[PDB]
Amino acid sequence: GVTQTPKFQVLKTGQSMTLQCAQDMNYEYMSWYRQDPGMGLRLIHYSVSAGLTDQGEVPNGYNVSRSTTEDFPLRLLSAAPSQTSVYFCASHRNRLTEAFFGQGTRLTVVEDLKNVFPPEVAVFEPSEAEISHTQKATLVCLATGFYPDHVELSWWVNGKEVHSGVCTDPQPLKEQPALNDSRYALSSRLRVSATFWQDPRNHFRCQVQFYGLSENDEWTQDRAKPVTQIVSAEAWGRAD
Amino acid sequence: MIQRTPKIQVYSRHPAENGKSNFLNCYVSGFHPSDIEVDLLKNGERIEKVEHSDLSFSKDWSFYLLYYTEFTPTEKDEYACRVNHVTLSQPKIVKWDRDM
Amino acid sequence: ILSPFIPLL
Amino acid sequence: GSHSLKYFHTSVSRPGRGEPRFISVGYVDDTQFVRFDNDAASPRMVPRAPWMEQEGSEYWDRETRSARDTAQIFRVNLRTLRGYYNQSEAGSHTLQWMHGCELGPDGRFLRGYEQFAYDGKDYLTLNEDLRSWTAVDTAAQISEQKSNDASEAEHQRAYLEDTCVEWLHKYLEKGKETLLHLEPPKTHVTHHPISDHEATLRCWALGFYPAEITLTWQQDGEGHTQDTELVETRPAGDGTFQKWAAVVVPSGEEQRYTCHVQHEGLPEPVTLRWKP
Amino acid sequence: KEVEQNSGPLSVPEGAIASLNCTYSDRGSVSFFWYRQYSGKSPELIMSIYLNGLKEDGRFTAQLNKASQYVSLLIRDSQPSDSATYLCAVGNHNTGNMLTFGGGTRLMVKPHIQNPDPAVYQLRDSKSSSVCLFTDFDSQTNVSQSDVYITDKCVLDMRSMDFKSNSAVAWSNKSDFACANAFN
């Protein structure tokens, strides 16, 4: 019903940016909320119908426009770190009835694009201790040194995505808790029977989708350009 | 698409006493649609500064209004209400009878 | 007061 | 006893002469008290009883918004119903909405009501259970289904059972002097010779409130097969109402004839006779 | 703060009733909502209530009491799926600014660890070089907190054994890498 774009977005302080939102329900009312981690949604701006807008609780930094019924883009004027947040668009039939939200936009604004890195991924192999004590093997995955915190970690078993036995961390760990611009770590467990681990024709892969720069961003440093990309790691199964 | 033709009553607020100030009412009711034209007449002449109620409606959906003006009945003067509607070929005119 | 709830027909 | 808080909404389409006309009026019982009309630069909800003349901006700012919102939705509905009935943009159309809540003598919700009408006929009706609707036709059925999928009835029942009643109380208090301190009819009989041999006796009832009233003529304290003209109850302009009921009778028999007046503001029914 | 929720988090045993509360300041509030939000994802509407009273759908009950200006949600037979943040939203008719949200309450549905076997392990990098892994402890163990990197705890579910472990990882770059007593 409600198409909001894009899912992730990094921005340089001072940049400007327009989140998109579109709705097939053809309802009068539309809204933009932001949500900072641990907090509720706060209303930025809303539109009662085509051709109208009103301010919400935290309008400052943001502009909206309602030309059509269908669409209601939110515009960041001059990005600041404070506008690092998750943005949800919604559509509503009446002012005070059900808000139908979009998928959300997670958006980090950073001083300098030098500070973006992809993740360094590493599959770890089951303890031998845990293989006898339990006849069950925990593969660990660890993705290191990424920024912004825009990642999606999956396990693939023989190039097929698994869910059973899986447990990613909920939030990541700040490598440096002091720095506002610290990079991130994120662990994850796939556990399977010691029998499925030791079949040597079995392949376990830890995929980590990352969201950084686009092609048309401009990069001026020695590292490889932190574009969107996957980064994987693997082990095979072992007779022992 | 229903159409209903206005009912009309023309009356004073208080019972008329020649020379004593009063109010002249025209009450149109029972009509659909809303659009309607009402004039208050002294001796066939349209009275300026006539007011009216806000537009409301009944259980049957028919609308009703009160047009009224300050007035000072005399023995000889005549008053009436003229109403034109879509259901009307030509204005209806109802004369104020002070005993009605 | 007016209804805070308005049907869309 | 039974009091009520009713609104009556009128939206009329004005093809290429702006957006539709929207007028909203609020009654308690028989007393208009607020109004909104979108003919002005600022259309604002406004008082139409002296006893609202002292309500602060929080009331008016909110109800203004509220009316505006309804106006805008009623534009949409007029478009939508044009659609369902395949009618042209060139035609003018009327959508009307009446809703209300009543109190019983206990001071508590008693019943609620809500009805829509397209071009002067029933379109969609909220049923007495305030949980379901009744469509009159295919077009209305689309509206029924949409309301069902939206739990409209729930939302309206919430207004009608709760909010409507809360505020009816507030208004009854604020307008006690008008709404609860009734006005009995000032009552009298005039005599009007038709012909040499018969007259019209006409029983007046003036300045009464509320509008409900009963005027009856009796010959020798009993019914009569006699010409009994009865005019529709009409507003005096001042908040009260008027009504008369005449009969035509043989001259010199005016004392056989008595007028019986029942009205809530009287302690007891009054009877009446022409006084020479 | 117009809509008050307790952040918690709250624990509920798997299978137990969860109960979540919300208060609100404006007597003008005319509509009420419970939204569920899984970490990362959007708010998703669990239940909507407008009339004072009790409303039931499936395992969920909501109760509204406008007299006392609270709305509440009850989850029967708590499942690990119900673990999430729960968002209270009111529609204030006095101010009209769409839906006003509380700060949310996070609910952690803890499962009963069948056979608690608290074991620390160590796991070699699958390319040369190691990470620590606390596992198989019970849902009442809470994991404790430079260069000593300890995750929060998290629960996996092998369905082909109806098995659920808790698991909490740690690592460091240091050669001075205790591990065996890493989790103190």
Residue numbers in the entry:
A (entry chain E): 3 to 242
B (entry chain B): 0 to 99
C (entry chain C): 1 to 9
D (entry chain A): 1 to 276
E (entry chain D): 2 to 130, 133 to 148, 152 to 190
Task: Quote what the paper states about this structure.
HLA-E typically binds nonameric peptides derived from HLA class Ia signal sequences (known as VL9), leading to its stabilization on the cell surface for innate recognition by NK cells. Here we report the characterization of three genotypic variants of an HLA-E-binding HBsAg peptide, Env371-379, identified through bioinformatic predictions and verified by biochemical and cellular assays. The crystal structures of the a09b08 TCR in complex with all three HBV pHLA-E*01:03 complexes were solved at 2.25, 2.35, and 2.61 Å resolution for the Env371-379, Env371-379 (S3N) and Env371-379 (L6I) peptides, respectively. In all three structures, the a09b08 TCR engages with pHLA complexes in the same way, and in a canonical fashion, with the TCR alpha chain positioned over HLA helix 2 and the TCR beta chain positioned over HLA helix 1, allowing both CDR3s to sit centrally above the HLA peptide-binding groove and interact with the peptide.
Unambiguous electron density at position 3 for S3N and position 6 for L6I enabled the modeling of the peptide variants. Structural overlay of Env371-379 and Env371-379 (L6I) variants showed minor differences surrounding peptide position 6, with the I6 backbone slightly moved towards the HLA helix 1 and concurrently HLA residues T70 and F74 pulled towards the Env371-379 (L6I) peptide. Additionally, the orientation of the peptide I6 side chain enabled interaction with HLA F74, which is further apart in the case of L6. The three HBV peptide variants adopt a highly similar conformation, and the positions of residues in the HLA-E binding groove were also largely unchanged. With a t1/2 of 2 hours, the Env371-379 (L6I) peptide showed the greatest capacity to stabilize HLA-E on the cell surface, followed by Env371-379 (S3N) (with t1/2 of 39.5 min) and the Env371-379 peptide (t1/2 of 6.7 min). Env371-379 (L6I) and the two signal peptides showed a similar Tm of 49 °C, Env371-379 (S3N) had a Tm of 47 °C and Env371-379 peptide a Tm of 44 °C. In agreement with the t1/2 of the complexes, we observed lower ImmTAV EC50 values against THP-1-E*01:03 cells pulsed with Env371-379 (L6I) peptide (3.97 pM), followed by Env371-379 (S3N) peptide (5.34 pM) and Env371-379 peptide (60.9 pM). The a09b08 ImmTAV molecule redirected T cells only to targets expressing the Env371-379 (L6I) peptide and treated with IFN-γ or overexpressing HLA-E molecules. Taken together, our findings demonstrate that the HBV Env371-379 (L6I) peptide can compete with VL9 variants to bind HLA-E and be targeted with TCR-based immunotherapeutics when increased surface levels of HLA-E are present in cells of hepatic origin. Of note, our structural analysis did not explain the differences observed in peptide–HLA-E stability across the HBV Env371-379 peptide variants.
